[PDB]
Fold this protein.
Amino acid sequence: RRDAALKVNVTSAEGLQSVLETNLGPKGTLKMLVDGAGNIKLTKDGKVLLTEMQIQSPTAVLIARAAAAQDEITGDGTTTVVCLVGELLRQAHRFIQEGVHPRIITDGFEIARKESMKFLDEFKISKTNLSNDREFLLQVARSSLLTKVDADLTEVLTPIVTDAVLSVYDAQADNLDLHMVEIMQMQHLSPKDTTFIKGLVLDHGGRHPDMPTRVKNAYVLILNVSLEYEKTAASERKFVDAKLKKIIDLKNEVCGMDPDKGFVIINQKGIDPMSLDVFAKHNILALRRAKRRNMERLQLVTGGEAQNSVEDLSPQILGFSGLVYQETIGEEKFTYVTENTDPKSCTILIKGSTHYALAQTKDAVRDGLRAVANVLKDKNIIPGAGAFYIALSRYLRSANMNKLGAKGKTKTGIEAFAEALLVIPKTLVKNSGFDPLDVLAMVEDELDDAQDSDETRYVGVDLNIGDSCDPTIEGIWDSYRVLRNAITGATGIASNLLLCDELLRAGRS
Amino acid sequence: GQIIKSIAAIRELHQMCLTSMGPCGRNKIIVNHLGKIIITNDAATMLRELDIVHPAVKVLVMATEQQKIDMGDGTNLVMILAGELLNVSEKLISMGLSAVEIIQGYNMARKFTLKELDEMVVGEITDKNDKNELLKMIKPVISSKKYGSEDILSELVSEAVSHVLPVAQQAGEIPYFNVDSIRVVKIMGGSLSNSTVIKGMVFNREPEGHVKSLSEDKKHKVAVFTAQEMLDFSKGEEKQIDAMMKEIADMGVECIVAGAGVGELALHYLNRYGILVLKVPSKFELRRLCRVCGATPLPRLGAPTPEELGLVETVKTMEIGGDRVTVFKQEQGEISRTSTIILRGATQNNLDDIERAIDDGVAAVKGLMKPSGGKLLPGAGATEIELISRITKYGERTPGLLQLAIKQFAVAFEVVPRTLAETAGLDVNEVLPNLYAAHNVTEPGAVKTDHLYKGVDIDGESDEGVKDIREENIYDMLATKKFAINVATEAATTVLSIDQIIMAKK
Amino acid sequence: TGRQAQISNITAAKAVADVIRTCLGPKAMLKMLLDPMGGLVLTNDGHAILREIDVAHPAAKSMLELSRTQDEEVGDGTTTVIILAGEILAQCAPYLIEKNIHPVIIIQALKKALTDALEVIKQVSKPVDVENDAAMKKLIQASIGTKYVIHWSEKMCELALDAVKTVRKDLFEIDIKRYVRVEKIPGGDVLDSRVLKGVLLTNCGLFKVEMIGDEYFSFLDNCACTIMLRGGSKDILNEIDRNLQDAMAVARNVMLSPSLSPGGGATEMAVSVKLAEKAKQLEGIQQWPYQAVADAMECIPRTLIQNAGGDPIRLLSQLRAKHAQGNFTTGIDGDKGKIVDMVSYGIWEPEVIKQQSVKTAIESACLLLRVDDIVSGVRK
């Protein structure tokens, strides 16, 4: 007899949006995950939360798997897609349970789906990305960090992300996410003390404490064959001194007057500390046990080239760096090298107490650098601060005989979609303890006053004072391609539950 | 919780009454909490003694009262028809059809059936006092009622109705029919051939003092009534009773009727003066005694008024069923109607089924006299097959949602011919084409073809399937069929109208 | 046991048929499954549904092999044919377990029903010439309406119709179309295709080798055709074969049966109203189980009404009156549940679609009736 399982499956699924209800907006609280081994992670990322959290209802488990595609689509605040489809299902229970057929009402949302992109086509605003104006760049960083970290960490990571997005750029709009990868993770000082490094950083250093801690001009050269001998005893050490003679000759050949320059050695194997005493007089830095991935990035940044034998040395294969300085933290010595030959790749030095607090910054700058990268890739940006929740709901609310496109129950599906878009803005002020009914009087009703003035104005919602604001002044902006597949994808993901007649338990026995 | 639950109880009772109706029908045994054993095929008596714990199915139980008051026969036909209409409607419920068109479908087809009953009527023949007409009415009851012997029972009833017949030939305009005019007495022992009919009514009582006849008296008379200080009440009553009983004997009253407590001193003088007395008359016997005899039950213990007295031409107190019994036996000439029929049988349960069969035969005369006439209908299931062709035609004449209700309404008629096949153990699928072979494709140009003229009678003819009902005089009552479709439709729509069972402070 | 064992077999196919009622048409719904292992499979295709589910009813296991036979011919829309086999089992409830009708008597009635069905199939026969490429183009696009590749089918379905006609020709016309070799190239745009007539590896025009990450290009001049498909995505190649390689059944069915029948479940409408008229002329004992088959024929189009959210009782009143009076070319719109006839609906299906549907249904229904009971625990 009929189905009756649809209302039961969604009822168990409604518990997912209730848990994620407080995850929306910058006023939300972070969710904590803990395992049986003692590891504890605190983050708002839906990919990590939905993966570790095991829901007894299998219906909400399969829907959580669809959030994996939201990484490239959005990556920051993917909970909005989950909370948008939660009330979208509840609006159907007021209809389908009354005798409305699911397939009939589904076509109503399918029409409003494509029509939402047509309204969004004229709703988007385009900017000039060739000028590289820092006014708009700092705002995009605020649209992310404020929704991730507090205001104290906001002014810290904002110039860090701003300098990172400007490091990779071109007049042809050439951007590569794989160009900037390495991010230093250290436990020390506090998460507020993190800084932006202008070059690559290595996790290994020399065993000689007397090496110069600051170098003006350093020449980076990758050495393949190990400087120290391995196995076939007095003739074995004479071969090392013969190799050190070429290093001393190369140091004095390049610059033979003022000792304002230095040379860097990268070795795959260990180096005898007794041979490092000669480098103290020549101010030559040496390394050992360097990974292959670290050496491959030096040729594209420092400008060096891997050399096998030290008998043939030329300045053509020697790179250079503008600033080099080293710092010894604990028993692990690190080398900070910036201003290289090709300084298009940088690193973000992140320090803190433990990995518990470090996971907040790592996931924030990872997607934050990609979110601002889409602004340079796609010049069209969508006004944030909840400006398009009321706008897209108002265009489909007023239809009459002008633009409708549906009839009967399909017409009610468009009206149900307009009410489904208003659950997010009512939730943003609900997490802060504000009444969403009074907010619409100063926000939703304000758009009607500006409409009679023959002017296009987009008004946002300020969560601090619980009043209206300007997304341009506040600086909250979202990319066009981020919300394009998010709104369209939300209809397809929610359809999977709408297209399900009943849940039958059966399978391989 | 109701429909599916009731149908489970409906299919139960429907299968029970399915084997009750028909000449091959079966009986059942019902034992109450007191241990009383009753064997009858009547559905009204069946459900009356049974204790049903399902309030939903009780609609069909109370619906029998409408049939017993209006007619009293065809009770098995109503329970089979009403039970089948709710069984065939189960398919429409699973299809999603609301009860609005289902109730309207049965009510629309009910009015169409009444229009066909007036067009399909045959055999007027309009004769009240013929002994053959009394045989044509009492013979068909062997289907619903006891089929054991229709030869002897039909003769005793025909002679009894003609004996109590008011006559008044041509137009007498005779009101006030007597249902009590027919009475039977159960006598243990003997066969049915020993049964006979008496011009007077009989009852079971035994004489004591006299046993003498006294009916030879040439217009006799009968009356009907509604330490020395310790002997003051004793001798006072002996002088009064003697004077009261002597004045009755002086008037020549051979028998008196005493409906009150009779003391020892009263019976003492009755043996000396030779006066018969009745011992403790019941309520129904007291009413029949004053109306037939025409005497006033004077409560005064003294001499009754000699002007108004009872009279019996011929009465005998001798043995009847082997024991001496004083009865009311009389002669139609000088006294009124309400004779009796004496039954003889070994099994007391078989005499009860004959009593219920004869009581339904009284309603056959009621159905003729009260309306213009009882008319006739094709018997042995031949009426339902005539309606199947009519109801099917009405489905095409009225296009709409009623076609689903009209279709199931015609299919429900298949239980009547299945009743004859199921009770006889024969395959209903073999007899089914023989039933359709009567009307063939269409009806021939002749009037009253094998469809109307013949019918279904299965003894040795099960291979042929068709038999003439005119020579067999197998017919159905018209007033019963009119009331059958009315009770079945009212009961079927009542069950569909049930929503939820309500209990108040219990 | 006995008749009680057959009741469980009727409900076994009835429970499975009720799930695939919504699996037909462009409005077809989806079904979610939960296995004891915890995996979920959500799809609208009943092929993978019957394969993954292990049923405890022995009668439902026979439908798994029947689905493989129906999917071997076409596979699109033929999965719901099992409903017809389930409606006949439920139609025997007033007869088999009530009137005590013998199964062979029902089977003998199905033999006359299958014979009379083929006569009705020849009544809706609408032959069409296969030489017109525009007429055959809209024919293969019939099954495309259930997918989003509709506007993509312009550069897709044209490659399938031209390749089959090369390997079909004549002999009758029976030939082997399996000599075609289809190559799929991941990545790129779906609009990019390769037109090649010959054998992929006298007076050859030219010889060249392109650049492809998979393999090189080689031409062989004969005195046989291959297809190189470039998909618009990575995993889209699975759906491309369903709209092209699996669509070759349309080109095979039009060559064997050039006639056309109403598409989208509109064929059995004229069959059910005609079967009821042929039953009145039988006039026999088998007439009742023979006429009751038409009641099982009208349950199939109700799936569209259940998908269109209409009332199957009230809507079919006017729909069945059009096929039994006006003409047999009328049909039912599956999208909106409307009376629009198949003339303007623009979709027609070959007769063999319903021929193999009814043939495999009657043959599967009689075998289920020939089973008296089911026993277990033999420990083979």
